């Protein structure tokens, strides 16, 4: 039940996710999951990053959900639940800007 998830922010806009994430106290990997503003059935994983090039910045990744059941950012790496997808990316950066570290305050 993704709505019970503390990292699930529900129906918030892309700009509002960036407002929350661009806080200086946030370390790399601070994240939240929200509904897509325009892709029915998809969610967006919003993640903070930091470098000397860009300073504090935010990346957005689309999480797809098949009616067949799997959740995924890349079709080659699927999960039975959004929760498992979050747990996997908390340990593997893979193609993300950073591994998921802390739930956005």
């Amino acid at each position: 039940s993704i709505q019970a998830e503390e990292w699930y922010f529900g129906k918030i806009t892309r700009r509002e996710s960036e407002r929350l994430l661009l806080n200086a106290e946030n370390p790399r990997g601070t994240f939240l999951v929200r509904e897509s503003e325009t892709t029915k059935g998809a969610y967006c994983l919003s993640v903070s990053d930091f470098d000397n090039a860009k300073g504090l910045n935010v990346k957005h990744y689309k999480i797809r959900k098949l009616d067949s059941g799997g959740f995924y950012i890349t079709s080659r790496t699927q999960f039975n639940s959004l929760q498992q997808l979050v747990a996997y990316y908390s340990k593997h950066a893979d193609g993300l800007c950073h591994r998921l570290t802390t739930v956005c305050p």
Side-chain angles (χ1 to χ4, degrees):
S1 34
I2 102 167
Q3 313 229 172
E5 303 303 331
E6 72 281 3
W7 35 260
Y8 188 61
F9 280 49
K11 185 202 195 185
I12 58 152
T13 65
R14 181 195 190 88
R15 179 174 176 90
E16 173 68 351
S17 77
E18 295 167 349
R19 191 191 59 83
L20 289 164
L21 293 164
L22 292 161
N23 180 305
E25 296 181 357
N26 292 335
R28 300 180 177 134
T30 302
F31 73 102
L32 64 80
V33 175
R34 56 182 172 88
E35 288 184 354
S36 171
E37 276 174 3
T38 51
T39 301
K40 71 300 126 203
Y43 302 95
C44 289
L45 175 59
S46 295
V47 189
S48 73
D49 201 5
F50 177 90
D51 67 19
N52 297 336
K54 317 183 160 209
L56 182 62
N57 62 102
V58 181
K59 289 301 198 199
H60 306 285
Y61 308 98
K62 183 164 270 166
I63 291 174
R64 311 264 232 294
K65 153 65 177 314
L66 303 160
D67 288 64
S68 326
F71 286 85
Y72 66 84
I73 294 176
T74 173
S75 70
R76 328 235 198 176
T77 312
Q78 306 196 196
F79 309 83
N80 302 322
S81 71
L82 189 57
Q83 297 84 159
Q84 289 168 334
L85 182 152
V86 164
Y88 174 93
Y89 290 108
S90 291
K91 301 282 193 176
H92 308 253
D94 285 8
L96 305 191
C97 63
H98 197 274
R99 88 174 176 88
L100 311 178
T101 60
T102 179
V103 176
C104 193

